[PDB]
Design an enzyme around this catalytic site. Structure first.
Site, PDB file in Angstrom:
ATOM      1  N   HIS A  47       0.846  -1.179   0.124  1.00 24.06           N
ATOM      2  CA  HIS A  47      -0.191  -0.089  -0.160  1.00 24.06           C
ATOM      3  C   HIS A  47       0.763   1.131  -0.099  1.00 24.06           C
ATOM      4  O   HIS A  47       0.382   2.397  -0.417  1.00 24.06           O
ATOM      5  CB  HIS A  47      -1.127   0.179   1.097  1.00 24.06           C
ATOM      6  CG  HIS A  47      -0.202   0.083   2.636  1.00 24.06           C
ATOM      7  ND1 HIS A  47      -0.419  -0.876   3.339  1.00 24.06           N
ATOM      8  CD2 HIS A  47       0.294   1.190   3.095  1.00 24.06           C
ATOM      9  CE1 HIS A  47       0.100  -0.267   4.390  1.00 24.06           C
ATOM     10  NE2 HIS A  47       0.596   1.036   4.491  1.00 24.06           N
ATOM     11  N   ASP A  78      -0.176  -7.629   1.191  1.00 21.41           N
ATOM     12  CA  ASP A  78       0.522  -6.308   1.389  1.00 21.41           C
ATOM     13  C   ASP A  78       2.011  -6.116   1.306  1.00 21.41           C
ATOM     14  O   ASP A  78       2.700  -5.504   2.111  1.00 21.41           O
ATOM     15  CB  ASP A  78      -0.168  -5.527   2.854  1.00 21.41           C
ATOM     16  CG  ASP A  78       0.120  -4.101   2.840  1.00 21.41           C
ATOM     17  OD1 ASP A  78       0.363  -3.365   1.457  1.00 21.41           O
ATOM     18  OD2 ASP A  78       0.161  -3.482   3.613  1.00 21.41           O
ATOM     19  N   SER A 156       5.086   1.219   9.567  1.00 27.77           N
ATOM     20  CA  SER A 156       4.287   0.008   9.155  1.00 27.77           C
ATOM     21  C   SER A 156       5.078  -0.289   7.676  1.00 27.77           C
ATOM     22  O   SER A 156       5.582   0.695   7.174  1.00 27.77           O
ATOM     23  CB  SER A 156       2.928  -0.091   8.739  1.00 27.77           C
ATOM     24  OG  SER A 156       2.738   0.802   7.466  1.00 27.77           O
TER      25      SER A 156
END
Lengths: 465, 369, 465, 369, 369
Positions: A47, A78, A156
């Site tokens: 993402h 992801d 992240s």
């Protein structure tokens, strides 16, 4: 120690406008975290680099930003896999080394960068639980580690380490938890291994297979008795099977799935996982590769049958994402026809779309299965006001069901039927028992000036030409 | 006047229950002929009524929120008014006079009639021409017609309604009201009385037809209310079956029910029509947990579509099938392609103890006797 | 342990009023932190003692305040060097000992005093990053350590220690970070060494040299090709050169700087610094002493040239500070003429001056180079109301461009032209195409009464007499 | 009246785009001669207009914010008024009548003329005497004159303007208005019509001269608006070139643009004058990132001063030079002494794919054809 | 009228300074005889005045806060009034007319006279009898008398004041005002003009005496203001000597000075009287730090009581003694039993450099020349 390999990921994005599918949004730059591994390779979140037009990487102790290459994108898990041509980037850093799947309550350290900052940040916590979850909403559920630590934007994508300095996966910010709940996730090593090994074999990402079935628990004794299960038998009942997964051929409704690849499945759909641990049986499936086959043992009419089934990826009627591709659209006489996907709904109705979108659409989003590989939900997105369409200007996000008597299967079909229309009138059967009627000749003539008024380059996206 | 009432409301989530007795206050006023007007909700589920004393309840006009001791005309501005209507907003005197005259001529409240059709505007010239409308013609196109209405016969989809009792209907479905003001044609319809006739002029296949149609009250699949009647329920083996209404939805999911209720149910609330006069949306309301229903306890507000291979039309129908069931197993097809299977003898034998545990007087409400 | 050497610095200040340059503000006392080092010497922040008229020092366990001496002030590096005559102050304390430049993520302890308090305070954190930054805004950028710890008023100026009890520099409160961001800086030992060694050799502070150039990155391949760079070559292009640094002679615009003192400079202006670390090339320059020479290798017309260049300090048109000197001003007929500097702008427009000051002035503050060593930006600061100046009373902070046809280079020039004015009229060419005209005879006569009305001691600061 | 409009606005940051269709509401009123007044912004970028229906747009008076279906006089106190003007503040009838009469005599909106001069007060007696003003003389000194105005000829810097059409101008630039009230002389000027003549009396070198000067509309280097025209752009190798206007600045830097925009651009917004009729401020707006422009991607809103040694005067001029460029390299001199160098053949060959990536219809807006 | 003024205020904390030039606005109104009334503070420390233009300052009535272009009567309810007074509260016309007539007959403002006495009520019957007051007698007992007033002669402590100009004073010090309203007798006194005579009837040792007493303005040890005059100061060796006034206290300690100022100074503000016509409270204001005064730098706002054994009466007196001092040492006796000792020659030689450091024009203000 291993902090030298944790890099800052700078990405320029050019996002499609899903509400105005002929437009791309303004360029913008976002920052996130990532880390160097073995073989001139860098991992980060998918993402973080969605709709990328340029990616750069920066090490902690150096101002230099290095032009990167996007090798592969695993949207469902992801993960993005990156490399860098410049050797100066690679020289001097000890690459991150992966450890085994951590036990419950094991200590984990997440290393990354804060938002709008270029200094190292260190977050700490323990492994809360094993979980099967979607990393993209509405998409295939995969193995994941829920952690005590709070994962946010920016950090992240950074590595998560055990007490041995081994990486146990990639940090992932919870989609379903607010930041004050101190809940985060780690995309675990077997999923990362899956993604990398998939790339190394096929020179591309091939996704994660699913068994295209919905199931119901068999915890009631009488239900089990009525379907012929002997008392030692356990498993789940098939509620419905995706028409676009055959699979659909071999399996049938009300089959009772007893086991998968030899592994015994209980009445609640669990399978043993480790000492004292049980997890959903989909973990046995999602760990396979697309194209792989699996032994499925079912009970059908009080009799055991075994099936070897070729596993494919999931085909959703309303896609969770469209793989970075441009959204499809078709215009005639100011009527903007497009297809419904999750990005479309989110763009149209905001983050609360699953409560604010028209019920007709929610139903098909939550419940409908694709009846064919080519099936799409086609809607009138909006009406671009002009004389040719006086009295229709209020139509918004309404399914097109038929054109001149013929059912609409997808957008290309509709665009095709409109191009080859010889009838005096174009007659669109819409949802809520509505009809739109346009004079074929003047409707087609009116299109150009409308496109010009709204600066629309083409009447249709390139995929329909 | 000051209205004083004692109320005993049904619990729609627990239909065998009545809520705790409570009292309220509102306003109203004396009208000629020894009668008093007030709100309908200011006396709903009454057990005793007083005024400022001891009053009598002749009729309740729910739709128009009037009591004498669904889209109607209203004015946005108790216990009214100054008299220009009823304080709700102000419910105007064309609605009030209708209520009184309805009762005064029928000795009961008979609501407000509807045409029982959904319609679409005819503002687009290409749409108009393709259906044979000359330039002077105005009206609206019938989208769909209620299967449970009388006019479901004589009218047809794609008919273009041109006029009602000789009053011209415009392309936007409006009719003239006063100088410089228009109103939706349904206003004309709601001014009629149930059972009245009305002339509806339509365009069908480029030809004009005029139908004389008897007007009736709207039958809705998921009822807006149940006219102070008690909610129905059927129970077997702890499975609580009931029918979906708006009060049920409000009681289950709160004030925001049109957003919080399950999508399958919302779709039927907003878009479904009764295909039959006695069709009800039957759901498993909840499961009263016990041995016999183990593994089933998380089923909530889910439609029952069939019993032992047979379609479920309403609550009474389901209750019949279960009592007459001689098969070894009872099989309920639920929504989301779920099934519920119970051994017939043991399931019937389990019902009583569950009723005792939850203090339920019998397996079903009196209306299912 | 080393806490005995960390002293409290009490300073009395007498600040000039930059808006009213004939005034000094009221005396006030501030407190900060400092520390004893070797050879009867004390280090603290320069800003803590700016405009000092008396400095006193206090040890943690004693009430006695000791009269101190200011040896030198390094404004650019924010260091003040102090000593004390009284021996009782020095006896019994173990002097702080300096360590090497810390590695990234190294632990650092900052010892100092809170605001309005005389007890020891201990702050902890790690080294976040190496940085090149200005310690005074608009001034020369120097080497610095960004730290995880929060440095505030009071404790800035105190020592920062490593885990070995060695001092790695002087605490410095961030000018660009709010206190809740937990970001602070440490003026590192090589800069401190620079400052002390500079004093020990010259018996005075001589500043930090700059290469008086602006540069542009050479990361584009075609740009590099068009200017004749062979593929192995890297460096930066000279955009512009300070007229007041020759330097200006030897170097030329569009030269490509390939290296500095033998150190290879990359296309982004970085040079290697340590293992896995890269920093801006100005660090190679700022570590030199004023007067030192450096080998500069450039590419000019596709040909390599080497220059040995004598390095000087930076001369700014609008000075970041004026070295504690009194601000210059000149008065005629109530017109207050002064020069624009950073303190002037801050005093006139507040801390947000870079957004609130007139655009004409901002432009010259952000972009203009001094065309000569003597060039100053001269303005009418304000008009002291009187009969002689009726109709001009609204003029505020407007550049004076010319006097009686002659261009104004600086304040002394203007004051000079006004003293020697023989013309009937004084004609000031101001910015925004304005003119001010005064009758020479009566304008000069009107000055005295105005000075008297506003209690202005002299018509001009002593530097102009 | 109630105004109902559908708008399609340009995106000034992305000039090849139109913002999403949206609708608005405002007020206005009927005036004699079959015409309606309303705000100009209450119909800007219209694609369809309705009133309370289907209206027509005759003329838009942007400067005076009037539509018929830059410093003017206003009153600080839709859709007006009570009639004493137009609700914006109240835009007075001397402005309204001007608007109508301008159109009614020219069949188009021709704005409000300006003298095109900056001026300084002559309140100081020494200033007055040094320029030969007798004690009875009043007026204002010309600071500077717009190079693109007609009066740029006949008037001169340091001229002292004494009167306009025989009306005396004071030392503070005011003229009489009503009893005990004065107003800036520009009021007199804005009351004239474009193309009208006016007598300007000035003092030059201690002598009186009277000029008959034709009045014109103000040409501004950074335009306050672009009269509902689309914003222009030119693209090559991902470099987006555009011209600076106020709407561009507002779209780039928000409502606080006079503080947030780059200082180099603010200076030209506040202080620069067009030296020529077709001079525009050309900037690199942004760089659409791609291989061909690597190392250039952080250039934002920076003026282009020259192309291959040649001065850039406007957007059309730059576009011409790039298409005709036969040299091996394209060299853009930018502000802050920056340069951009691109190989000519490869840069031209790179343009198309970048356009495709960002869905841009062509390399330039239609006005640059 | 709209008042427009430019002000240059003294800095009382730094008496050699003037604060930055600033402008203000207020209201006022035209009165007959070519004069305008406004607030006194709306023109205090003026350097230029304008009205709505160029005005002239004839007189400033500080105590009554009036300007013509300390306890007086006021009304609790600019730029007044409606005319019933002056907006401050409303300063009434008996005060206004007084101001005008004071100037109109003396060509200068001469304030409002006071009797210069403190008094105590005679409400207790035992108190009254012990001093020989018959039952019909009313009045107030003199507590203390200002040494610097003329009446300090003829009146005596414990005199009982019975009447003023034939007006009876009550036991609570009030006199009749209107029907059902009374007012303090000082009202009668403040209605007189400076220099006027007045008859004061008193009881002394049980005998009645009537004195004819010339009225004067109040001399206060710590002055309420200094009539727009500059504050005085004397400096030697960095020691800043000044006199205590209310503006000084306000500038030193803020709006809450009657609580925050040192107690020794507050006592003299509230309770001390000038024992002599030219007595001032002299303090060390602050010490401008330098070698010569090391060890003295924390002395702030402390009274000087003596110089070289000799009492300090005022600022001019102290300044004289220091210049004439031939002794080896200068010895200042301060409050709190502190002493300051400086070598005379070196202290005088140190003054100049300190003045230069703080930009002070000379060692003393011009009034001490």
């Amino acid at each position: 120690p291993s902090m030298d390999a944790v890099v800052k990921v700078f990405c320029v994005h050019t996002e499609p406008n899903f509400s105005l599918p002929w437009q791309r949004k303004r360029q913008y730059s976002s920052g996130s975290s990532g880390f160097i591994i073995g073989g001139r390779r860098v991992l980060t979140n998918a993402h973080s680099v969605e709709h990328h037009t340029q990616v750069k990487l920066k090490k902690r102790g150096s101002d230099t930003k290095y032009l990167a290459t996007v090798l592969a994108i695993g949207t469902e898990c992801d993960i993005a896999l990156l490399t860098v041509t410049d050797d100066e980037f690679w020289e001097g850093v000890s690459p991150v080394e992966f450890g085994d799947l951590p036990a419950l309550q094991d200590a984990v350290t997440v290393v990354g960068y804060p938002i709008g900052g270029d200094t190292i940040s260190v977050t700490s916590g323990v492994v809360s639980r094993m979980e099967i979850l979607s990393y993209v909403h509405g998409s295939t559920e995969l193995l994941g580690l829920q952690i005590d630590a709070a994962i946010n934007s920016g950090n992240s994508g950074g590595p998560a380490f055990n007490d041995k300095g081994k990486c146990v996966g990639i940090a992932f910010q919870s989609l379903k938890h607010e930041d004050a709940e101190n809940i985060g996730y780690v995309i675990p090593t077997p999923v990362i291994v899956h993604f990398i090994q998939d790339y190394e074999k096929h020179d591309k990402y091939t996704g994660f297979p699913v068994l295209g079935i919905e199931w119901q628990k068999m915890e009631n004794p009488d239900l089990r008795k009525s379907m012929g299960m002997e008392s030692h038998q356990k498993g789940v009942r098939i509620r419905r099977i995706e028409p676009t997964a055959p699979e659909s051929q071999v399996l049938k409704p009300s089959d009772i799935i007893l086991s998968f690849d030899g592994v015994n499945i209980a009445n609640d759909g669990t399978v043993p996982f480790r000492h004292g641990e049980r997890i959903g049986f989909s973990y046995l499936i999602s760990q396979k590769y697309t194209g792989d086959s699996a032994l499925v043992k079912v009970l059908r009419n009080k009799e055991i049958l075994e099936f070897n089934i070729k596993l494919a990826i999931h085909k959703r009627l309303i896609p969770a994402h469209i793989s970075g591709k441009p959204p499809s659209y078709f215009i005639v006489a100011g009527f903007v026809f497009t297809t419904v996907s999750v990005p479309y709904l989110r763009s149209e109705y905001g983050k609360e779309y699953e409560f604010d979108a028209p019920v007709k659409l929610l139903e098909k989003h939550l419940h409908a299965m694709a009846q064919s590989v080519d099936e799409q939900l086609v809607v009138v997105s909006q009406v671009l006001v002009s004389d040719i369409n006086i009295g229709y200007e209020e139509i918004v996000n309404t399914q097109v069901v038929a054109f001149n008597g013929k059912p609409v299967k997808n957008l290309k079909g509709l665009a095709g039927m409109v191009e080859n229309c010889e009838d005096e009138y174009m007659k669109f059967n819409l949802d809520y028992d509505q009809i739109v009627v346009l004079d074929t000749k003047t409707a087609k003539e009116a299109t150009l000036d409308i496109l010009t008024t709204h600066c629309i380059p083409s009447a249709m996206s390139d995929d329909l030409k």
